[PDB]
Amino acid sequence: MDIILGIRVQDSVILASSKAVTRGISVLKDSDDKTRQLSPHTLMSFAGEAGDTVQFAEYIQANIQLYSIREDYELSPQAVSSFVRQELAKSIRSRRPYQVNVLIGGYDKKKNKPELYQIDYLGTKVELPYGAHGYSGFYTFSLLDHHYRPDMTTEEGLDLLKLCVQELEKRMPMDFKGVIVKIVDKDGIRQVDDF
Amino acid sequence: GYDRALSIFSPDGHIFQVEYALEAVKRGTCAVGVKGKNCVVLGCERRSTLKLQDTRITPSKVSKIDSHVVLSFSGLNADSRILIEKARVEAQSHRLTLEDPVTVEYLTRYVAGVQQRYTQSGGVRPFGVSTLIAGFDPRDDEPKLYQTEPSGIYSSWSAQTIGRNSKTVREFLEKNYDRKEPPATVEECVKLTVRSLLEVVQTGAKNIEITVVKPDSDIVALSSEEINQYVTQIEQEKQE
Amino acid sequence: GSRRYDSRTTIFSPEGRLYQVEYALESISHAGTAIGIMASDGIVLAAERKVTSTLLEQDTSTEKLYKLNDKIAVAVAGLTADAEILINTARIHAQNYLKTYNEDIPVEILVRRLSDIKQGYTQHGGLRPFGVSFIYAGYDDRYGYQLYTSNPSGNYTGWKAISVGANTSAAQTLLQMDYKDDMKVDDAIELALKTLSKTTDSSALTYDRLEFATIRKGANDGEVYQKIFKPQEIKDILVKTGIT
Amino acid sequence: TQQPIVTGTSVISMKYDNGVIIAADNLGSYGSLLRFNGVERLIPVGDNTVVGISGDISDMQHIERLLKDLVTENAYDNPLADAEEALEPSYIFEYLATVMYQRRSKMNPLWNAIIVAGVQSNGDQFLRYVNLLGVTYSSPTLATGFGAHMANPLLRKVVDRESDIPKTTVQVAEEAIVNAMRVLYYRDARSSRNFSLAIIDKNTGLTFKKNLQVENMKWDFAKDIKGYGTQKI
Amino acid sequence: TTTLAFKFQHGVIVAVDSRATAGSYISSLRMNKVIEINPYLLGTMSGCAADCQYWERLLAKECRLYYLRNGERISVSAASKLLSNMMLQYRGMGLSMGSMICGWDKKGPGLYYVDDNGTRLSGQMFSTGSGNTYAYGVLDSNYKWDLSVEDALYLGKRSILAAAHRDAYSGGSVNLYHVTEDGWIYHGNHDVGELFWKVKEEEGSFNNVIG
Amino acid sequence: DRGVSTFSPEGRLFQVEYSLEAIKLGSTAIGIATKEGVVLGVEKRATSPLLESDSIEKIVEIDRHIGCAMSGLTADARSMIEHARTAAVTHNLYYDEDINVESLTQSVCDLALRFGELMSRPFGVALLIAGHDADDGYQLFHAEPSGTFYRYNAKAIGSGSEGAQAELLNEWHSSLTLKEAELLVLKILKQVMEEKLDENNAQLSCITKQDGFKIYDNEKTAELIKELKEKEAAE
Amino acid sequence: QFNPYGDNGGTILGIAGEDFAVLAGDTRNITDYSINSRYEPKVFDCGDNIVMSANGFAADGDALVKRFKNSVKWYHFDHNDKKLSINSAARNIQHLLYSRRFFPYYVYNIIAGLDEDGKGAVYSFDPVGSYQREQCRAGGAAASLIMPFLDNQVNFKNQYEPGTNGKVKKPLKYLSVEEVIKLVRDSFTSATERHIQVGDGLEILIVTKDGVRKEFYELKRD
Amino acid sequence: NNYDGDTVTFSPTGRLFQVEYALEAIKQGSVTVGLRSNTHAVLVALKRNADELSSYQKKIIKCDEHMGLSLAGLAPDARVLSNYLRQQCNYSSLVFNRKLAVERAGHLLCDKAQKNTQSYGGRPYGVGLLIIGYDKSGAHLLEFQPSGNVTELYGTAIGARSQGAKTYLERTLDTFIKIDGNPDELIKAGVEAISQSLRDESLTVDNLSIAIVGKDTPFTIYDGEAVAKYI
Numbered sequence A: 001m002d003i004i005l006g007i008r009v010q011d012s013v014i015l016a017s018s019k020a021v022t023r024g025i026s027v028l029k030d031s032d033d034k035t036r037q038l039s040p041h042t043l044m045s046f047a048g049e050a051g052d053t054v055q056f057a058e059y060i061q062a063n064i065q066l067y068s069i070r071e072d073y074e075l076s077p078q079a080v081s082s083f084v085r086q087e088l089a090k091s092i093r094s095r096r097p098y099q100v101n102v103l104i105g106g107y108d109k110k111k112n113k114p115e116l117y118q119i120d121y122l123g124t125k126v127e128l129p130y131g132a133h134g135y136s137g138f139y140t141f142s143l144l145d146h147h148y149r150p151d152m153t154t155e156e157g158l159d160l161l162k163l164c165v166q167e168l169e170k171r172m173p174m175d176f177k178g179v180i181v182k183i184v185d186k187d188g189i190r191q192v193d194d195f
Numbered sequence B: 001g002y003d004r005a006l007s008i009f010s011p012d013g014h015i016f017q018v019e020y021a022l023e024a025v026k027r028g029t030c031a032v033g034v035k036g037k038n039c040v041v042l043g044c045e046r047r048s049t050l051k052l053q054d055t056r057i058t059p060s061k062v063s064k065i066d067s068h069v070v071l072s073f074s075g076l077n078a079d080s081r082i083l084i085e086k087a088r089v090e091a092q093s094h095r096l097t098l099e100d101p102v103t104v105e106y107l108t109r110y111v112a113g114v115q116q117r118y119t120q121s122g123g124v125r126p127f128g129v130s131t132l133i134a135g136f137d138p139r140d141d142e143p144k145l146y147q148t149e150p151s152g153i154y155s156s157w158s159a160q161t162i163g164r165n166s167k168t169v170r171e172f173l174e175k176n177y178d179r180k181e182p183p184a185t186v187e188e189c190v191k192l193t194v195r196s197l198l199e200v201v202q203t204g205a206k207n208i209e210i211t212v213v214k215p216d217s218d219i220v221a222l223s224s225e226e227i228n229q230y231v232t233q234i235e236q237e238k239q240e
Numbered sequence C: 001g002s003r004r005y006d007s008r009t010t011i012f013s014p015e016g017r018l019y020q021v022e023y024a025l026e027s028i029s030h031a032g033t034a035i036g037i038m039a040s041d042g043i044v045l046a047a048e049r050k051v052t053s054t055l056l057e058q059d060t061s062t063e064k065l066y067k068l069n070d071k072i073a074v075a076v077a078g079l080t081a082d083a084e085i086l087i088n089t090a091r092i093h094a095q096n097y098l099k100t101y102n103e104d105i106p107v108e109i110l111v112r113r114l115s116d117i118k119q120g121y122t123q124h125g126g127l128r129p130f131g132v133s134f135i136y137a138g139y140d141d142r143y144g145y146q147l148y149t150s151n152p153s154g155n156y157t158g159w160k161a162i163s164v165g166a167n168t169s170a171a172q173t174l175l176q177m178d179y180k181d182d183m184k185v186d187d188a189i190e191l192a193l194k195t196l197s198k199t200t201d202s203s204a205l206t207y208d209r210l211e212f213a214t215i216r217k218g219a220n221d222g223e224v225y226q227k228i229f230k231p232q233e234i235k236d237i238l239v240k241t242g243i244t
Numbered sequence D: 001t002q003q004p005i006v007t008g009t010s011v012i013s014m015k016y017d018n019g020v021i022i023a024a025d026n027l028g029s030y031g032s033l034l035r036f037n038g039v040e041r042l043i044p045v046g047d048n049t050v051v052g053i054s055g056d057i058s059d060m061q062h063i064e065r066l067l068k069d070l071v072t073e074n075a076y077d078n079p080l081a082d083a084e085e086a087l088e089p090s091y092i093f094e095y096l097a098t099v100m101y102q103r104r105s106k107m108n109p110l111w112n113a114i115i116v117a118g119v120q121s122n123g124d125q126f127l128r129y130v131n132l133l134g135v136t137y138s139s140p141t142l143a144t145g146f147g148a149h150m151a152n153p154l155l156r157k158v159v160d161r162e163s164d165i166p167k168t169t170v171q172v173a174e175e176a177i178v179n180a181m182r183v184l185y186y187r188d189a190r191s192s193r194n195f196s197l198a199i200i201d202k203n204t205g206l207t208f209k210k211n212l213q214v215e216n217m218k219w220d221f222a223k224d225i226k227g228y229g230t231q232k233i
Numbered sequence E: 001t002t003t004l005a006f007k008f009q010h011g012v013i014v015a016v017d018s019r020a021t022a023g024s025y026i027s028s029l030r031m032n033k034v035i036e037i038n039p040y041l042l043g044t045m046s047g048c049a050a051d052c053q054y055w056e057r058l059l060a061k062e063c064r065l066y067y068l069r070n071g072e073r074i075s076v077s078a079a080s081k082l083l084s085n086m087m088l089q090y091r092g093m094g095l096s097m098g099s100m101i102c103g104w105d106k107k108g109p110g111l112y113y114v115d116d117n118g119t120r121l122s123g124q125m126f127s128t129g130s131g132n133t134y135a136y137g138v139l140d141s142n143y144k145w146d147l148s149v150e151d152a153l154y155l156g157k158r159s160i161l162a163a164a165h166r167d168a169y170s171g172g173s174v175n176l177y178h179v180t181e182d183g184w185i186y187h188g189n190h191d192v193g194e195l196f197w198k199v200k201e202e203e204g205s206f207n208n209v210i211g
Numbered sequence F: 001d002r003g004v005s006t007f008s009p010e011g012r013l014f015q016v017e018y019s020l021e022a023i024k025l026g027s028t029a030i031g032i033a034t035k036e037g038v039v040l041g042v043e044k045r046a047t048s049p050l051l052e053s054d055s056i057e058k059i060v061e062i063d064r065h066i067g068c069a070m071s072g073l074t075a076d077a078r079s080m081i082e083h084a085r086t087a088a089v090t091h092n093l094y095y096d097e098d099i100n101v102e103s104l105t106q107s108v109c110d111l112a113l114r115f116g117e118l119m120s121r122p123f124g125v126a127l128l129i130a131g132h133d134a135d136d137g138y139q140l141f142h143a144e145p146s147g148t149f150y151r152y153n154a155k156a157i158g159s160g161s162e163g164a165q166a167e168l169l170n171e172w173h174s175s176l177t178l179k180e181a182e183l184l185v186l187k188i189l190k191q192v193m194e195e196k197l198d199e200n201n202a203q204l205s206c207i208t209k210q211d212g213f214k215i216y217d218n219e220k221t222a223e224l225i226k227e228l229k230e231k232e233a234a235e
Numbered sequence G: 001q002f003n004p005y006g007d008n009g010g011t012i013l014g015i016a017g018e019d020f021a022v023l024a025g026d027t028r029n030i031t032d033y034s035i036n037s038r039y040e041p042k043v044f045d046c047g048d049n050i051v052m053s054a055n056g057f058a059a060d061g062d063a064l065v066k067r068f069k070n071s072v073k074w075y076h077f078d079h080n081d082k083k084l085s086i087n088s089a090a091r092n093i094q095h096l097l098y099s100r101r102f103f104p105y106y107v108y109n110i111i112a113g114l115d116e117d118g119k120g121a122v123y124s125f126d127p128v129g130s131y132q133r134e135q136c137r138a139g140g141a142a143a144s145l146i147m148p149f150l151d152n153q154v155n156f157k158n159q160y161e162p163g164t165n166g167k168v169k170k171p172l173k174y175l176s177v178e179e180v181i182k183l184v185r186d187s188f189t190s191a192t193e194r195h196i197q198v199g200d201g202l203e204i205l206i207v208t209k210d211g212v213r214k215e216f217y218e219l220k221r222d
Numbered sequence H: 001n002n003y004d005g006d007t008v009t010f011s012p013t014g015r016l017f018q019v020e021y022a023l024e025a026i027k028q029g030s031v032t033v034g035l036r037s038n039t040h041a042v043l044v045a046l047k048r049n050a051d052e053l054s055s056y057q058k059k060i061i062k063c064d065e066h067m068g069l070s071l072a073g074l075a076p077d078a079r080v081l082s083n084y085l086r087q088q089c090n091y092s093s094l095v096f097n098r099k100l101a102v103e104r105a106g107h108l109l110c111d112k113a114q115k116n117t118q119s120y121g122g123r124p125y126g127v128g129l130l131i132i133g134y135d136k137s138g139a140h141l142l143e144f145q146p147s148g149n150v151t152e153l154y155g156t157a158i159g160a161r162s163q164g165a166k167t168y169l170e171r172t173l174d175t176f177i178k179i180d181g182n183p184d185e186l187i188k189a190g191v192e193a194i195s196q197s198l199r200d201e202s203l204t205v206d207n208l209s210i211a212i213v214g215k216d217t218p219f220t221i222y223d224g225e226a227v228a229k230y231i
């Protein structure tokens, strides 16, 4: 999987991720969900080498779920993102590094703030209002730089996201088969079924 | 490494270390498990020798292993943490490798297997802990209640109690619990669990903990006032 | 072979008790009394040094109160050398947690970790347990101010007020009598010292025979300050509360 | 993985009616340099076996020590060490063959080609080959390196198949071996005139001949050869 | 090779070819590319024959042990995941395996694609091997959920035929399977040479080919 | 104290002999082998009426052609069963065939004496391993913690063993049918059991070539108990 | 750089009859353009009425055969002298080959014998352990020369019944042991003519319920 | 007494009591007889049953085509030691293409048993073995004790009441050694020897176990109706 976007608006974080999975010269699937719920108010999308992505995501998911049960408490998006970064920074000097880039969208219930973290496979973490991995940013960041405000509503965020996807669909050579969009806010995680 | 065989057979065919581990369980605070028609309730004794306690932060007696399974115990508190941790790890390991949450029977079988391993491994002593494991299997509305003990044997129970004065509350449950018609509602199930603990507890104040587990990961712990209302109603009916 | 000389430190008695844990607790009961009292606006840690000398350098001395991090401290009762082994482990665990999650370790998580280490020495390895009982005084943003205790068995519990070491029976009765929920730090300071003054085996309670510490939100705005009292400061608070 | 440094060239051998013959020159080459002229590459094991080795000389000396130790070890707690439970050619070979294959399987071979020639308890002739890869084969005639290309054709004219063995005498077989060694001296750039020859007969036992020389060589016709085509003087 | 599998109203169809190649040389005219793991579980094979046979036969051991421990058949989802986890141990060591785990369990019919990278995908239709592109063409244009067992068996059979014809490394014969809730059902070995001529005449397809 | 692998002056391993005493305290298990199949039956012995008896699993499937009953410290049997199941399936992986009942039993018994100062003590449980293969037909083995295994035509282990074994001595003959064997296990179990035998506190099972290993339903066993009562009242 | 592999040439052929089986192979051993031996046995009697030949790299072939022979020995020890069936031997060999998935036995292996119903059986293995039961199979250097001939003359491929013109196939009538040996000899004689690594001699091992019999035939030595 | 708690302890008179107690386990075991001529070597073993429903415990184990043993004592220990012999016989064949000499097989068993008598934690083997074989120096019979002592003999017997059979063989020494090229007569002498150790019970069809190895005879075991000929 190649394409993953993220945008943090006033009261939520929105993650958009492509649906395509390719094998050799054939597209095997056009409805693949490149995301895992780490906790009720934390969602992680991912992109990178085949196999490694899901493994890493599920491994992180298992660790956060274990923590949640042990402490009867949900870790902050910041705490989760730091754990994820360390695992990747640990990984890059391994015999075989996991080649996975992630976006972590979460709503901090303590601070009542949405938070978006971008982490690449090297363990390079940055908190952003909007982010992307791979070539996605090359096409979309100019639009986001122009249109983005921090006081945007969730509906305005989705409209700006549609504009980003339209630009990708126009100028990218690859057909990524559209995106699955998910929203993370105070009430938890939900999927936008029509996009 | 320290390899000494601590759990060994005696001339009369007994493993004393395993039997002395049961004596530690006998010393522990009373724990009780009762399953109704659509729920399971876990009751636990809190000894009132310890006041000035901070009840917010003090380790609670009932522990969630997953969102749909709970574990209570009687015996050594420190030993119980090791079993709970292992169980919690195995629960996530099962979800990760098989893509289904553990069944209550499987989780019990794992915890029982850990206890057994510590009865024939060198350098280690048995866990001084007996557990009550309860919950509902994924996409199933049949209640599950299991018991384990230091030897590593486990079995399913309609209702069971462990710990100090468990002999008395088991006596109560055996005459009060009908298999043909179990506690139909949550109220009836909690009432029967509180009644059973009132045979042993002393005061019905902060000495009784109740945790109700319903199907589909619906687990809640009752508060002091909610339990106190059951304590009030039971004795008012008793004055007759 | 070697079996002949093995004491077997990790076995049950016929009554279902751990011999070495019980005997370690017997050792701790002769150690200097340490008291912890939790208030709404802070925590107090008071402790009695054991029969000191006039030639002991007190201002550079530390046998009872130790700092685990900026938010958490411990009072010790038992073998000091054993406690320092555990204290350094606890300090490392707090830093590991901070490095991993970029947040200060919650008090209970640190307590559980140390208590699990103590537990391990009672179940495997064939080594003697640590002859130490801790009182943990700490703060985090989840539960606020917290008091815990751990003993050689590896069992830990939370408290509003608690004592360890010598004369805990007498001390716990006195605390249970005068403690109230709406209590404040300055009142708790007074209660801690009054309790030690009555339970002490010494003729009188003086500044040179005490270690004292507070954890206060009495730090400029929303943050927490640890105060390890100096000898002169302990002398002043003894006069203030009217003990000397 | 290595490369051979000091090397030994062809080892040649053949069966005859009552036993086997084996031969090898006394040279230890260092690339194109004919460095060591007094090297023995035929190593007897008891009075019934001779191991001829080509390839890396340091690895040869290692094998030589393994065999020396093998004899020592067989004598341990063995009253019949010089009789029924003495070392057989087939035992010695299979041991080496096991070692050679194990070493190649660890990617650290003994850079050699070995021919074990001997006579068994029951009088049967033994002649088998093994190399750095652990590859083994048996034939009425065996030769390593250049011997495989030049000596075998000559020796196979004497013993072309199994039925020719009883018809071949020791005088004929030795004559063929000695001629083959002369041909190798003419044509192999890493060969020497001096060589050793060993005969293992089921009747007369082990005969080990040292300090042999290639003789009866033809060189006279060289005087008539002038230039490379058109030159007359 | 060419393999395919798809879910439909009456379970799942599984069709494979039988050719095996060692370069341009056809080493085998009839290789079994389906493994029978249990009466309700099948596994297709594409890539290295040895890898496909070993790891899927090792899956069957592990799926069998599941039944003994739990007294219950393993799900298709869990079986596919065990296999993907095996592939993940020999990550980058050079294994070549592409398989579809087809079966019926409590959730109904199940179909999972698994390969050497560790990829594990759920889906209604899959096709693997050198001839998958040809098979997808026929499948995508003719597939429906409302297919009859007779028509569905034909579709999978016809799809392999399309690939066997065009792809040089696909052919030999067609092996058909139909998975129901009572288990899988073998629907025979069909020589492509004979099947081709038959389909040509009856269907009217392959007009460009002379016969 | 003393070594775990110590010999007594009589030439027996103390620990092995003591584990045999633990097995005598266990609930009764009986096995009978016939030419129509092997029958395995056990006493459940619930410690309380609130204990759901159907959760008491003292008869266990190792493979489709091999079953197993246990007596003694039943918790110790779990790792033995796990090993047996692994051995049975692993052999099927390596050799594409069913494993011989004797070979399976031998594999289980190889664990027995792997104790010292490996596990810290012998197993405190005996096993009746019953099965069928093509070479030796229907078989019944008794696997002890000594590492020894005997084949039996019929065998009883547990607390009522010597009383049951004497009864099996008289009753067994080479022409027993499966139905006759079923009733015979029920009869002897009912004789040695403390509580009154019924479908809830006793369990039957069998292994046949056709249908393989099967644990009997409580409804099926109940009918065999009723059939037993009537035939005993018949004379 | 050290190359742990080599090519010793050779060609093998296994054919399954109705109640018999043959495993044939030439006796020539080679490296590059040299002949090592004109008679080096390549097909072995492994016991329990099974014959094997591991063609390709001789050192790996000898090692594998040696290990399987050993596997048969221990199968008797461990399972009460039970006879190792041909299907069980095949699966055992798969696991022997895959133990070196990452440093393979560079050999093409064939075994022959009788199944548990008494019918003829041949199994074929790739170097990394993929096996399959077959009726007919040639392996090694001249495998591509021989197999098409066996498709035509054993399974009657592309052969139809005269008069019908492609409508009716030639019926698949069973072959006798004498008929099979003729096809084997003609296969190797033809292969010897056009392949330089094939020649010297041909050794055939025939397996029936009565046991294992050998037959040897000369081949051209050029 | 105070010096029998483990194998690592000498008594004041220089005795190893744990080894002596292991030796006692052999005396409790059922009788087995070994004897040989110059061409063949024979094992005869009285098998023991638990009861009438039980089978008769097997006593003879094959190690190679040319070697095998009979046991008396702890059967699992015989399985461990016979497995070791199987491997050693097999190592000799695979590496050296050489059948393992019976004398050397005895030396290997001796050294394996010895290590268990000098180290703490372990225990001595609780079984006695009679190894027969035919190698390059003809027929052989060995007696193995778990003390480590291995002895080459013409004939012997171990187990309960083994003294009766041993005396018989000591009388018959000059006769049975000469039984060359006659396997049936050598077995007869063995069956007659083991009969001197019987009381109350006699040799039945499922009671008797016989094994033989020789010049042109692979190690083969006879049980059931195959030994009815010799009853």
Ligand SMILES: *[C@@](C)(CO)[C@](*)(O)[C@H](CC(C)C)NC(=O)[C@H](Cc1ccccc1)NC(=O)[C@H](CC(C)C)NC(=O)[C@H](CCc1ccccc1)NC(=O)CN1CCOCC1
Pocket: E001, E002, E019, E020, E021, E022, E023, E027, E028, E031, E033, E045, E046, E047, E048, E049, E050, E052, E096, E129, E130, E169, E170, G104, G126, G127, G128, G130
């Ligand atoms: C279609 C037909 C092609 O994609 C299918 O995918 C089939 C499916 C399998 C189940 C049959 N795929 C193959 O047949 C597969 C193609 C392939 C091979 C390798 C990697 C990826 C795909 N073919 C094989 O696995 C063949 C099958 C044999 C005939 C049973 N095997 C080989 O090619 C082997 C293994 C590779 C190898 C191992 C060790 C050393 C060298 C190569 N190769 C050979 O046997 C080559 N052999 C070398 C010696 O001289 C003779 C040829």
Ligand SMILES: [Mg+2]
Pocket: A118, A119, A120, A124, A125, A126
């Ligand atoms: Mg980045």
